[PDB]
Design a protein around this ligand. Structure first.
Ligand code: CA
Ligand code: CA
Ligand code: CA
Ligand code: CA
Ligand code: CA
Ligand code: CA
Ligand code: CA
Ligand code: CA
Ligand code: ZN
Lengths: 4, 470
């Protein structure tokens, strides 16, 4: 879910 | 009493300690295995075909925006726009391939170059509008529409992704994002954009860039110092985590391998090209007679050949490590005064110039002090038993020293060495021999008193009673  | 040389060996053997139940920087301390479990907490992974021991994944570099890019909000609640799309430059593609290679080197994954397009299991692309981070990726437990994608920011304000290269942040970013696509999480529950995380938010003390490229925190938090460099490849805990997931790659570098100067690894991150090279690496090696060659540095170094141990190499601190399950055999110091610690197998340790301290440990070690006043340290009788003695290959009387001060018999048993020409059945008797014709010598000690040597050291050069400490 958008892991930076 | 224990000499200073012995103390230096003991102190370094216990440097960078991990585990236990005491607080470290306000956090619990975890061992490599405990950290690996933490990094794998999402329980996400790619599935290997039934029966396949090797996972094959393809990769490609996008040439146009995909569905996610065009309508981010349909997939992730927080992103509304990614700005303008751009394809990976030749430099980015080249560096991406090196990062992928560094992961496939340690685990059972084979990456297949699918070229330009969106056909790869893993895809790469750039975006221009900041989403609160330098880049982002999706773990394998997302819908097929997002699976395997990693995105990198490139704009007039942020240029780290434009020029990735060995040792810089752009290169570590590629390795880090690829780690996410394979199933690895950050070591703690934090993420760019969610609140304002700091190291105080880590779950365990060792969540730093000295142990994992998946960490956000500087290595100085745990006592290491890479002087501005960033690890280009998976570190100690990353290797432990990925291998638990996809298995250990047992065919990598199975020949005799040299790391550091004169490297035959064909890996930029394992190779030193000058005395100014800043090395940061964790050794994964599946077999052969291997060597850590740090001969080109002039700084004082501390090299430890034990698995999972950290070394202070080329002026940096805790920058070189050996992965769990790896046996490295030899080490070569530089022109500074070095500390070389061997492991349980037969090691070849070479101090080079400078006043070095060498500790072979178990096994029949071949020790070379080189120029300078070198000290060969012993902490247990078993380290150089009469059955498999070390050989001091270039001993120079009056310069080098044999240090036995740390042996239990001297520190605790209060034994006094008595030099004789033949054993008579008394504990503590020692025979120092030297054949001036062959230039071969020997020190044999009967610690038990049965007239049979329990400890022995072979010498090339003469040693006198004045050369033996305690
Ligand atoms: Ca090897
Ligand atoms: Ca080996
Ligand atoms: Ca040296
Ligand atoms: Ca030396
Ligand atoms: Ca050894
Ligand atoms: Ca010497
Ligand atoms: Ca030994
Ligand atoms: Ca004996
Ligand atoms: Zn991340």
């Amino acid at each position: 879910g958008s892991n930076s | 009493g224990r000499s200073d040389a012995y103390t230096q060996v003991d102190n370094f053997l216990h440097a960078y300690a991990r585990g236990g139940d005491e607080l470290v920087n306000g956090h619990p301390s975890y061992t490599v295995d405990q950290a690996a479990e933490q990094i794998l907490r999402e329980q996400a992974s790619w599935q290997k075909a039934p029966g396949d021991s090797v996972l094959t994944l393809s990769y490609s570099f996008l040439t146009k925006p995909n569905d996610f890019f065009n309508t981010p909000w349909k997939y992730v609640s927080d992103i509304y726009s990614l700005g303008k799309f751009s394809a990976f430059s030749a430099q980015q593609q080249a560096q991406a391939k090196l990062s992928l290679q560094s992961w496939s080197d340690v685990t059972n994954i084979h990456f297949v170059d699918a070229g330009q397009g969106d056909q790869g299991d893993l895809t790469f692309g750039n975006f221009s509008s900041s989403v609160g981070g330098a880049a982002f990726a999706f773990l394998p437990d997302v819908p097929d529409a997002l699976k395997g994608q990693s995105w990198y920011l490139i704009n007039s304000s942020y240029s780290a992704n434009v020029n990735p290269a060995n040792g810089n942040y752009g290169r570590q970013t590629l390795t880090h994002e690829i780690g996410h696509t394979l199933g690895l999480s950050h070591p703690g529950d934090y993420n760019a954009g969610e609140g304002d995380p700091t190291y105080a938010d880590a779950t365990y003390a060792e969540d730093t860039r000295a142990y994992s490229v998946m960490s956000y925190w500087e290595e100085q938090n745990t006592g290491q110092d890479f002087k501005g460099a960033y690890s280009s490849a998976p570190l100690l805990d990353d290797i432990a985590a990925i291998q638990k997931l996809y298995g250990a790659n047992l065919t990598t570098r199975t020949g005799d391998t040299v790391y550091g100067f004169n490297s035959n690894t064909e890996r930029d991150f394992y190779s030193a090209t000058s005395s100014s090279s800043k090395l940061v690496f964790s050794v994964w090696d599946a077999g052969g007679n291997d060597t850590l060659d740090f001969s080109g540095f002039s700084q004082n170094q501390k090299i430890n050949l034990n698995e999972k141990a950290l070394s202070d190499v080329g002026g940096l601190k805790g920058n070189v490590s050996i992965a769990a399950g790896v046996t490295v055999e030899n080490a070569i110091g530089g022109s500074g005064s070095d500390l070389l610690i061997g492991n349980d197998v037969a090691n070849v340790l070479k101090g080079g110039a400078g006043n070095d301290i060498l500790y072979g440990g178990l096994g029949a070690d071949q020790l070379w002090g080189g120029a300078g006043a070198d000290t060969f340290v012993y902490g247990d009788i078993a380290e150089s038993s009469a059955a498999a003695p070390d050989t001091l290959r270039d001993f120079v009387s009056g310069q080098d020293k044999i240090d036995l001060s740390g042996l239990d018999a001297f520190v605790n048993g209060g034994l006094v060495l008595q030099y004789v020409d033949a054993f008579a059945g008394k504990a503590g008797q020692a025979i120092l021999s030297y054949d001036a014709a062959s230039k071969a010598g020997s020190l044999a000690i009967d610690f038990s008193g049965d007239a049979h040597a329990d400890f022995a050291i072979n010498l090339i050069g003469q040693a006198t009673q004045a050369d033996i400490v305690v």
